């Protein structure tokens with residue numbers, strides 16, 4: 001869990017935490033009470049607290065007077081490992097040394113607050129499986145807690161059971177009636193996750209996973225949207241709770257950090273994970289490194305795969321077409337304009353209609369453009385220079401109407417677009433991964449990919465099937481940093497899936 005992130009504290013509270021429990025170099029992060037997307041990094045230095053604003057407008061986290069990042073945990077990791085980079089306006093170095101840990105259990109996935117033993121039994125009996133657990137406040141003994149764990153065989157009939165374990169709070173510390181006394185509920189839970197309790201007759205109280213509360217029956221998505229809309233809101237809690245799981249996803253991005261690739265990244269610290277990056281072959285032996293593009297393979301796991309990538313730079317257009325060729329991709333989804341709010345988001349990597357251009361070893365002909373309301377389709381022919389028999393059609397679906405701020409007011413445009421993309425891809429035997437990009441290749445790109453993954457479950461299984469939006473996003477975020485950036489995008493995913501279901 002992301003311990004240095006304190007949900008539901010004020011600025012004044014943050015200052016006092018850092019002044020009373022911190023030292024110089026201690027820091028924490030916190031969200032705005034009013035605004036999803038606004039965050040503050042609070043840092044103790046020279047016996048005082050400095051607050052630094054962070055904003056997410058949908059494409060990345062933007063640290064004021066600092067750099068752009070895919071996640072707050074990648075931001076924190078960066079400044080803890082690169083001394084001198086975070087600076088005050090007058091030049092003075094702001095050091096992030098010591099994460100100040102949140103002791104408040106409220107945001108933990110396993111924490112259920114005021115919840116009865118009867119209610120906890122019902123939740124575990126209906127939704128739980130072997131090793132599902134939760135912690136709740138004791139009704140009998142104020143300040144105490146109860147750990148409730150389901151154990152059994154998952155293949156009803158007494159083969160499973162719920163066990164309740166009392167957690168005492170004695171003199172500011174937590175225990176289970178013996179052994180170690182913990183400074184927080186979190187420390188206690190983490191210890192008994194690693195070191196399971198055993199009953200008198202041998203049952204191991206395995207804390208395998210927090211009770212799942214977010215999985216739904218897809219046909220009931222409207223009721224879940226209603227529930228998540230209740231007022232801050234359910235949607236915000238859910239997206240934040242998911243965000244608290246991002247420290248499990250700090251996978252190496254060593255290749256993207258190499259000096260030989262520094263000019264190949266649109267944003268210096270938004271990098272592909274090494275374990276999923278697209279590796280480019282047959283490269284120019286004269287180039288110091290020719291195997292790198294800022295792109296990751298996204299494979300759903302619980303047929304069709306994706307390449308999530310950034311908007312091309314002038315110097316990466318040739319690499320982009322090498323990738324498209326190598327991976328046998330026949331469909332590109334572009335979800336940005338070239339220029340938005342005065343800023344270039346993607347260089348034009350395609351020729352004008354009816355024109356032919358060479359891009360290094362590759363050539364692309366733009367055969368025909370077809371303009372719909374929300375998108376333009378460009379029928380491109382890609383081939384290797386010298387080898388006409390390598391020609392294949394690449395269909396570029398360019399979504400034009402995504403708003404400059406926030407998300408579209410309805411999902412119909414995105415749904416229609418994604419339906420055309422899906423059918424084109426499905427019609428081409430042996431097509432490779434669908435290439436998807438925006439500007440940084442994480443916010444909108446993540447949103448379109450996750451929508452597509454969830455819709456495809458419904459295509460296969462019908463509307464009577466389980467879907468789990470945050471679970472799916474965590475799986476995609478394990479393959480490219482920070483996929484799905486904002487709460488507005490998260491709500492839009494639910495909106496798109498709901499309206500897919502409603503138009504069957």
Ligand SMILES: N[C@@H]1c2ccccc2CC12CCN(c1nc3ncc(Sc4cccnc4C(F)(F)F)nc3[nH]1)CC2
Pocket residue numbers: 105106107108109110111112113114212213214215237238239241242245468470471474
């Ligand atoms: N602590 C909360 C509280 C406070 C006072 C009173 C009651 C309650 C319940 C409480 C916890 C349980 N609820 C909850 N919401 C969530 N949203 C996203 C996620 S992430 C997820 C989901 C599914 C699978 N895999 C992941 C992964 F970890 F891999 F990302 N998990 C969630 N769990 C509802 C909110």
